[PDB]
Amino acid sequence: GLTYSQTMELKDSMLQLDPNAKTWIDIEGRPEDPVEIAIYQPNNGQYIHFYREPTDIKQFKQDSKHSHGIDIQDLFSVQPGLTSAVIESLPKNMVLSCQGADDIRKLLDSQNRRDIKLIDVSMQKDDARKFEDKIWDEYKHLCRMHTGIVTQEVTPHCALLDCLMFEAAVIGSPQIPTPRPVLSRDLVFRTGPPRVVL
Ligand SMILES: [Zn+2]
Structure with missing residues (x-):
């Protein structure tokens, strides 16, 4: 749950989107227990x-080792709600590509x-991830949450990077306008442990 001020901040930040513009959506974890949106x-x-943070641990452990490589301990400090x-x-009546x-x-x-409509681009598995290596080379810094070795050894799946590479595959180039987060880190995460005094 968010606070009154956190709620006002999020709504304000979300209004930075053009409600009509082409908008992608992607998620990691099952829809009844998502871990990354x-x-x-x-x-x-x-x-x-x-x-x-997930509620079903057994699944999460499966998804971690075979899809997103997220360590559960890294989710303890994320902001709930x-x-x-x-959503x-x-x-x-927004329309979302996926x-x-x-x-x-x-x-x-x-x-x-x-009332929210979906457009499934329905690309083939490998066509969707054509530019996976390049997108990871350029935008890895945007999400450091995928720390575990994933096997299907392959590149971990990130909700964010998947959006970027899906856009890339649709247009035919990894050349996209610079991605910028609309959410502050203070809203995504809870203030963590205090600095170790060195
Ligand atoms: Zn990620």
């Missing part, structure tokens, strides 16, 4: 990107956001 507007580079707070304040719409449709429906 990304909403991205390729034209202006703006993105909403946050995390969530962001998933419902974000609630997305514009009325790769595989099944899970995202379930997630939006669970939030009573049936």
